Amino acid sequence: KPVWAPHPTDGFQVGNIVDIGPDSLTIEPLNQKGKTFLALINQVFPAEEDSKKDVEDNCSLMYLNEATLLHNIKVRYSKDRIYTYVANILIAVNPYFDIPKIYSSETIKSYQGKSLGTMPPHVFAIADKAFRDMKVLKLSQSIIVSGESGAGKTENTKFVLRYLTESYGTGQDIDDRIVEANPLLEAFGNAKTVRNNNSSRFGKFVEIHFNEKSSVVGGFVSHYLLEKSRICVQGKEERNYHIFYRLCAGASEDIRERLHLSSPDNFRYLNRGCTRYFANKETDKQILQNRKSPEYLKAGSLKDPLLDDHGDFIRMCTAMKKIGLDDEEKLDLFRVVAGVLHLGNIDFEEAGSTSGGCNLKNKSTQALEYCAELLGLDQDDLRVSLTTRVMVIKVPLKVEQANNARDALAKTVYSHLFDHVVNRVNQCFPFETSSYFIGVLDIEGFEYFEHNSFEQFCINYCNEKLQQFFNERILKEEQELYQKEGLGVNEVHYVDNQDCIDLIEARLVGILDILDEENRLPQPSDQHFTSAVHQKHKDHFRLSIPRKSKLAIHRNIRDDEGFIIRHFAGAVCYETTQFVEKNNDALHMSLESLICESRDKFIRELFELSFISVGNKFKTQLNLLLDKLRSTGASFIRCIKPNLKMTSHHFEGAQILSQLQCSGMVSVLDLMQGGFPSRASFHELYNMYKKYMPDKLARLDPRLFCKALFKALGLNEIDYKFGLTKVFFRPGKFAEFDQIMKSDPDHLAELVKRVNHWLI
Ligand SMILES: Nc1ncnc2c1ncn2[C@@H]1O[C@H](COP(=O)(O)OP(=O)(O)O)[C@@H](O)[C@H]1O
Ligand SMILES: [Mg+2]
Numbered sequence: 189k190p191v192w193a194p195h196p197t198d199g200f201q202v203g204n205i206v207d208i209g210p211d212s213l214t215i216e217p218l219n220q221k222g223k224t225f226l227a228l229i230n231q232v233f234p235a236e237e238d239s240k241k242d243v244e245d246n247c248s249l250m251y252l253n254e255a256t257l258l259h260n261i262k263v264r265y266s267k268d269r270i271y272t273y274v275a276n277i278l279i280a281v282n283p284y285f286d287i288p289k290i291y292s293s294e295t296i297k298s299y300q301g302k303s304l305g306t307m308p309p310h311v312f313a314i315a316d317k318a319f320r321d322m323k324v325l326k327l328s329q330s331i332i333v334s335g336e337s338g339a340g341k342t343e344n345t346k347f348v349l350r351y352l353t354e355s356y357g358t359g360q361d362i363d364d365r366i367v368e369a370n371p372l373l374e375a376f377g378n379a380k381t382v383r384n385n386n387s388s389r390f391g392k393f394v395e396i397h398f399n400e401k402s403s404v405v406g407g408f409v410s411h412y413l414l415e416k417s418r419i420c421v422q423g424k425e426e427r428n429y430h431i432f433y434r435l436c437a438g439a440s441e442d443i444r445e446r447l448h449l450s451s452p453d454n455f456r457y458l459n460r461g462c463t464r465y466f467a468n469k470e471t472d473k474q475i476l477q478n479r480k481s482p483e484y485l486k487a488g489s490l491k492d493p494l495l496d497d498h499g500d501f502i503r504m505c506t507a508m509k510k511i512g513l514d515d516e517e518k519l520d521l522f523r524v525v526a527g528v529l530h531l532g533n534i535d536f537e538e539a540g541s542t543s544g545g546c547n548l549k550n551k552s553t554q555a556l557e558y559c560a561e562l563l564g565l566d567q568d569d570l571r572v573s574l575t576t577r578v579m580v581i582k583v584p585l586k587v588e589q590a591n592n593a594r595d596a597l598a599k600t601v602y603s604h605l606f607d608h609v610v611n612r613v614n615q616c617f618p619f620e621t622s623s624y625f626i627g628v629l630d631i632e633g634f635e636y637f638e639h640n641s642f643e644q645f646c647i648n649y650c651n652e653k654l655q656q657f658f659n660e661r662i663l664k665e666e667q668e669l670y671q672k673e674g675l676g677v678n679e680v681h682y683v684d685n686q687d688c689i690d691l692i693e694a695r696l697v698g699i700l701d702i703l704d705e706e707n708r709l710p711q712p713s714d715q716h717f718t719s720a721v722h723q724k725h726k727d728h729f730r731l732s733i734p735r736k737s738k739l740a741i742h743r744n745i746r747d748d749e750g751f752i753i754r755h756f757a758g759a760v761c762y763e764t765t766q767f768v769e770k771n772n773d774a775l776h777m778s779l780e781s782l783i784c785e786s787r788d789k790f791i792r793e794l795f796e797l798s799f800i801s802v803g804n805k806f807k808t809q810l811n812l813l814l815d816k817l818r819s820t821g822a823s824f825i826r827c828i829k830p831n832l833k834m835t836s837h838h839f840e841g842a843q844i845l846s847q848l849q850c851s852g853m854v855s856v857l858d859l860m861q862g863g864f865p866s867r868a869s870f871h872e873l874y875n876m877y878k879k880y881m882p883d884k885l886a887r888l889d890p891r892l893f894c895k896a897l898f899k900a901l902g903l904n905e906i907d908y909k910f911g912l913t914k915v916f917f918r919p920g921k922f923a924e925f926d927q928i929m930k931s932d933p934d935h936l937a938e939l940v941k942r943v944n945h946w947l948i
Contacts, residue, residue: 189204190202190203190204190218190235190239191203191204191205191215191232191233191234191235192232192233192234192235192253192255192256192259193213193215193225193227193231193232194227194231195841195842196842197840197841197842198841198842199255199258199841199842199844199845200233200255200258200259200841200845201217201218202217202218202235202239203215203216203217203218204216204218205232206224207224209226211228211229212226212227212228212229213226213227213228213229213232214226215227215232233251233253233254233255233256234251234253234256235251235255235256235259236249236250236251236256236259236260237250239259240263241263242260242263242264242267242269243260243272244272244273244305244308244309245272245273245274245275245305245309245919245920246260246261246272246273246274246279246857247273247274247275247860247861247919247920248920252857252858252861253857254845254848254849254854254857257274257848257853257854257857258841258844258845258848260272261279261281261828261844262839262841262844264281265281265283265830265839266837266839268283268287269308269309270282270283270287271308271309271310271311272309273304273305273309273919274853274856274857274860275860275861275863275865275919275920276304276317276823276865276919276922277824277825277826277853277860278309278311278313278314278823278824278825278826279826279828279853280311280339280340280344280825280826280827280828281340281827281828281830281839281844282338282339282340282343282827282828282829282830283836284493284830284834284835284836284838285493285836286493290310291347291350293354295310295312296312296350296351296354296355297355299312299313299315299316299351299355300316300355301316301320302316303922303923303925303926304317304922304923305920305922305923306922306923311344311347311348311351311825312347312351314331314348314823314825315331315347315348315351315352315626316351316355317823318331318626318821318823319352319355319356319402319626321821322398322402322624322626322821323402324929325821326623326624327624327820327821328624328625328626328627328816328819328820328821329624329625329626329627329820329821329822329823330626330627330628330629330816330817330820330821330822330823331348331626331627331628331629331822331823331824331825332629332658332817332822332823332824332825333345333348333628333629333630333825333827334633334824334825334826334827334851335633335826335827335828335829335847335851336383336633336827336829336847337381337383337384337387337632337633337635337829338383338384338387338829338834339827339828339829339847340827340828340829341388341630341631341827342374342378342386342388342630344825344827345392345394345628345630346367346370348628349366349367349370349394349396349628350367352396352404352626353366353367353396353404354367356398356402356403356404357403357404358403358404361510362404362406362617363404364510365407365510365511365512365616365617366394366396366404366407366617368507368510368511369407369409369507369511369613369616369617370507371500371503371504371507372504372507372508372511372609372613373392373409373411373609373610373613374386374388374430375429375430375431375434375500375504376429376430376431376605376606376609377389377390377411377414377429377606378429378430379415379418379422379426379427379428379429379430380426380427380430380461380462380466380490381426382423382425382426383832385466385490385492385494385495385834386430386492386494386495388630388632389414389415389418389429390411390412390413390414390415390606391411391412391413391630391631391632391647391650392409392410392411392412392629392630392631393409393410393627393628393629393630393631393813393816394407394408394409394410394627394628394630395407395408395409395410395625395626395627395628396625396626396627396628397619397622397624397625398622398623398624398625398626399622399623400623402624405619405621405622406617406618406619406622407614407617407619408614408625409610409613409614410809410812410813411606411607411610412631412650412806412809412810412813413643413646413647413650413806414603414606415643416599416602416603416770417599417641417643417770419457419528419598419599419602419603420456420457420532420595420598420599421457421460421461422458422460422461422462423460423461424460424461424462425461425462426461426462427458427461427462428457428458428461429602430495430497430500431525432452432455432457432458432525432529433452433458433465433466433497434497434498434500434501434504435447435449435501435522435525435526436449436450436451436452436465436479436497437465437467437475437479437497437498437501438475438497438498438500438501438502439501439522441476443519443522444478444479447522447523447526447562448526448530448558449526449529450478450479451463451478451479451480451481451482451484452481453481453482453483454533455529455532455533456532456533456535457528457529457531457532457598458529462483462490463481463483463484464481464483464484464487464488464489464490465479465480465484465489465490465497465498466489466490466491466492466495466496466497466500467489467490467496467497467498468489468491468496471496471497471498471499472489474498475497475498505518511613511616511617512616513612513616517612520790521605521609523562523788523790524562524563524601524602524605524790524791524794525605526558526562527559527562527563527601528598528601528602528605530555530558530559530562531555531559531563531594531597531598531601532594532595532598533552533554533555533559534548534552534555534556534559534574534594535548535549535551535552535555536548536549536552536574536575536587536590536591537549537587538586538587539584540584543586543587544584544586545575545584545585545586546575546584546585546586546587546589546590547575548571548574548575556570556571563601563783563786563788563791564786564787564788564791565782565783565786565787569782570782573593573597573778573779573782574590574593574594574597575590577589577776577778578777578778592769593776593779596775596776596779597775597779597782597783600773600775600779600783601783601794603773604794604795605794607794608793608794627816627820629813629817631650631654632647633647633651634647634648634651634755634757634758635647635648636648636758636760638741639763640760640761640762640763641762641763641765641766641767641770642766642767642770642771642802643770644760644762645753645762645767646802646803646806648753648755648757648760649692649693649806649807650806650810651755651757652685652688652689652692652755653689653810653814655685655756655757655852656684656685656686656689657814657817657818658824658852659682659684659685659852661817661822662824662852662856662859663680663681663682663856663859664682666859666863667679667680667859669867670863670864672912673911673912673913673914673916674911674912675864675909675911675916677859677862677863677864678858678859678862680855680856680858680859682855683756685756687728687729687730688730688753688754688755688756691725691728691730691731691753692753693807697724697725699721699803700801700803700804700807701804702717702720702721702724703717703767703768703771703801703803704771704799704801704803704804705717705720706720706768706771707768707771707772707799707801708797708799712768713768714748714749714764714765714766714767714768715748715749715764716748717764717767717768718747718748718749718750718751718764718767719747719748721751722747722748722751729754730753730754730755731751731752731753731754732751732752732754733747733751733752734746734747734749734750734751734752734761735747736752737752737759737761738759739761742761745761745763748764749763749764749765750762750763750764751764757850770802771801771802771803772798772799772800772801772802773800773801773802773805774798774799774800775798776798777798780795780798783795826851826853828844828847828848829843829847830843830844831843860919861919863918863919864909864916864917864918865917865918865919865922866916866917866918866921866922866925867911867914867915867916867917868914868915868925868928868929869913869914869915870890870891870893870894870910870913870914870915871890871913873890873893873894873897873915873928874890874893874894875890876931876936877893877897877936877939877940880933880936880937880940881893881940882940882944884944884947885940885943885944885947891910894910894915895910896943896946896947897928897939897943898915898928899946900939900942900943900945900946900947901924901927901928901939901942903924906918907921907924908921927939
């Protein structure tokens, strides 16, 4: 009798149906007699009879729907059970605090070789299933960790990496290098954003490579779309990359003196953002007084259960030593970081009777000196490169143009430093050859803000391509197998998004190719590019002018000042200002030759009509990644962010419900529950057992031996279904399936003995 009906903040609330009308049901909230509210018939769902219970797999619910799914994960979350299955897919709700012992070495060991379902749901079980599938099927695997910013993708990626290296490594230094590589990549690629104190400003695919004996041989890290705009400016609640703050907070006085460092408020590239450190009562006392900004002294430290700028500087230097970085290489990295900081302090003032030129402000003399010394440049060549343009003739730059040249040089040097760090991490765990890998995908999903630039365009483009892979693997390929096998599974359909992908990436006509054309034109213009997009895709349903928007913020945006992409995740209005600049990865020749000719070998090595397409470079990287995903077995982890406050024990029902819907988790519930995640051919099963069989068993047709096997073991018509050529096992039947598949001679002989006795 009790049902789930809508609730504005909880998603759903319990009640009883007390009336029915056209397109409505009248709901009486539980224990509130006389009180009633209306709900649309299709927004009312049956509830589980027992409101207090919780199930490890949502496929075990009597009524599986969005409301019972929400309730089950809610009850589990209130008891710190953050992991729940939907058959072989994992839901992980961010706890926002460290739950004791659930990632211990002892917990790691308890998951080794255990079938799904034998142990409570855990990220360790997803990782072990990927390893066992890799080892048995002799097929490389991918683990995809998805969700909103701050949902837990990066933490779960690291749990997977730690589980696999610790369980299936050797017990040597190399095993820890894959894990120890994290403080280093996160120092240069992560930063404080309003949604996550440890936001990943780059995407990654981390592969653990194995030999034929299924033992770790090395790793490989692929990195994508490092956010370049962050290097020079941030919003008042956000910070630049962690490294700048870890260095200012933690560097010894000797390093601080050598690098001419000071409190973060003294640097343009840090002082528009938050200048405070992540610290607690203890670590705040380890930070010297000359490192603390006036705002840190007035407002105190930033609070986080994971991040600590001083502690993280120490841990990063330890991780650098552990992976094979010599003290000289560590100092070379720090010198480049400081050089970029001092570069940003180079200020300009107008010059010329019509303000057509510029000069360095006399107060930027120290900054120019420190920058040139740290980057191995001559002060005058740097000054000239930042204030003039070569075209035979050296013409003056306007202040705005000198600011852009300094910033372009800063972004390129820093991005090249990040490429060097990722390459150096790959060099610390190399492998000449391998049989298979387990790859873990950690990339930011679909995003939209009041103002959307080239960064959002690239990540949302990425999302359109990844969403298609999810649809093709989870829905299309799965159901085609069910259909070919005559299983009669109710069909779940999707609308393909090839039209939106083609709009962005098609040869010659796609947005990326139109943008590259603009960059190659004699005088590139963001307005010329946007008009060319509109003029080319006038009849395209996924594209519109910003005036067509359902919001007042886009009303004043001109046709040549933006465009709307009608992504299936929602319409996104992109402002196309700086798209041409953001699409170019190559420095002007004057800045390139300046930095290529540095006195410093390390700087020269970072760089060992100038245009390189950011969009097409990314499209090529993404197609390489998609090739790997399509050629491997896939496992999925859906990370869920419980609230927008980074707090523990605060389950925002409607926010979580929205994630369950927008992720496609709700749409596949019936498919997952009525599906068959485990399968093997009658032929392969018969062939494995055949040498252990007496004549009475071998004389049976493969399909008939399988029926005899399953009957002898007490398996029932509920647990499995026979297809045309394969036997299929239901969700929650992984242990029974694994017992059927186990190829050990003693095991095979024993099950055959049981079949012989059963037949008598
Ligand atoms: N399982 C977990 N245990 C403890 N803290 C967690 C866990 N998952 C996430 N967190 C916390 O939430 C923060 C954000 O998680 P993170 O993995 O960085 O998100 P994402 O990569 O999805 O943006 C972490 O820095 C950490 O404080
Ligand atoms: Mg992350």
